[PDB]
Amino acid sequence: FSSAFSALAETLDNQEEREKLTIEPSVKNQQLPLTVSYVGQTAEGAQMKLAQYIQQVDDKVNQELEKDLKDNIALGRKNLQDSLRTQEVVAQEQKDLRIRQIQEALQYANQAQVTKPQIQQTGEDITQDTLFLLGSEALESMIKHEATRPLVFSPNYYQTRQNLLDIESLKVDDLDIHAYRYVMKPMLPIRRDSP
Amino acid sequence: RIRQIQEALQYANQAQVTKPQIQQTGEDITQDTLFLLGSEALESMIKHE
Amino acid sequence: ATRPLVFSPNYYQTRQNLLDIESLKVDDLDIHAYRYVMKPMLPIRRDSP
């Protein structure tokens, strides 16, 4: 705001008749509160003109941010719909290895003659070596029904899937941006400055 | 999880596991060892979906 | 010789980091090194003489 209000201050000196309009910090040490001003020709006509020029810069900043957020959200859900496609092909390179681990464990369970499952339980996922204890019959169905076996997804996938539904749900039209706050409404003066 | 159960009914239909063979599980049951719950107990996890 | 290798979860991180570096496109990527807060004016009062 303070750089777009001082950029309105320099396009009002390019009028045929100049209109002075300034902006400055209030006390000479800290940055804000800022102190805008304007000189006119009447008491009423220099307060109406200042409250118009505050709303003119405010409607330029507020439209340069709803336009900026729409180019950030519609591009932010493109780097997430891509990051769910490259994270799914990794999740099928793990599935194509799990079918290959099962396809080797059918050869171990065909020589050791394990047909019915000998596993009573497993407290974790079954590794490569102890995979043949599921049986010769139950491992022949994990290869026959291979293309319909569902993928498994890491908990980082469901984090960036929930991060895409959060970026698709927020709305910028009803979102209100305000770049400034009145601590003093624009006054109308009693004593003129000249003559 | 319904799709993991729906595939594990096909494994437990060929291996002929009807009654549950699991005595316990110290964690959640994964995709591979899900067919040990049985053919009968996995037909009710799909009917009551 | 047909027994499959097992890969650490740092391998599948840097495998997913290669598919992310092969998928991004620089032709449709727009870079802007500046932003107008004031369009270039045309002056009314000259400077000299």
Author numbering:
A (entry chain A): 99 to 293
B (entry chain B): 196 to 244
C (entry chain H): 245 to 293
From the publication, what sentences describe this entry?
Polysaccharide co-polymerases are a large family of membrane proteins that play an essential role in regulating the length distribution of the synthesized polysaccharide chain by interacting with the membrane-bound polymerase Wzy as it assembles the growing Oag or ECA polysaccharide of the LPS. Key to the Wzy-dependent pathway is the polysaccharide co-polymerase Wzz that is known to homo-oligomerize into a unique bell-shaped structure. As well as being assembled into bell-shaped structures common features include a membrane topology consisting of an N (TM1) and C (TM2) terminal transmembrane helix, an elongated periplasmic α-helical domain containing a predicted coiled-coil region and conserved sequence motifs such as a Proline-rich segment proximal to TM2 and a glycine-rich segment within TM2. With that in mind, we determined and herby report the structure of a fully intact example polysaccharide co-polymerase, WzzB, from E. coli by cryo-electron microscopy to an overall resolution of 3.0 Å.
Since an octameric complex is clearly visible in the unsymmetrized map, 8-fold (C8) symmetry was applied which led to a marked improvement in overall resolution to 3.0 Å. The high quality of the map allowed ~95% of the amino acid sequence to be unambiguously built, revealing structural details of the transmembrane and cytoplasmic domains as well as a highly conserved proline-rich segment proximal to the C-terminal transmembrane helix. Herein, the loop is positioned on the inside of the cavity and extends to the center of the periplasmic domain in a similar conformation as seen in the structure of a Salmonella typhimurium/Shigella flexneri WzzB chimera. While the first two prolines of this motif are seen in the trans conformation, P293 is best modeled in the cis-conformation in the density of our structure. The cis-conformation of the ω torsion angle of proline 293 creates a unique kink in this linker region thus helping to direct the C-terminal transmembrane helix into position. In the octameric assembly, the 2-helix bundles are ~32 Å apart (when measured from center to center) and do not interact with one another. Within each bundle their closest interactions are at their cross-point, which perhaps not surprisingly, coincides with the conserved GXXXG motif that has been found in ~50% of all α-helical membrane proteins and is suggested to be involved in helix-helix packing. Each of the pillars is tilted slightly inward toward the center of the chamber, reducing the inner diameter from ~75 Å on the periplasmic side to ~64 Å on the cytoplasmic side and the outer diameter from ~100 Å on the periplasmic side to ~83 Å on the cytoplasmic side. However, at the N-terminal end of the protein, a short amphipathic helix (α0) runs parallel to the membrane and interacts with TM2 of its helix bundle as well as with TM2 of the neighboring protomer, which curves slightly toward α0.
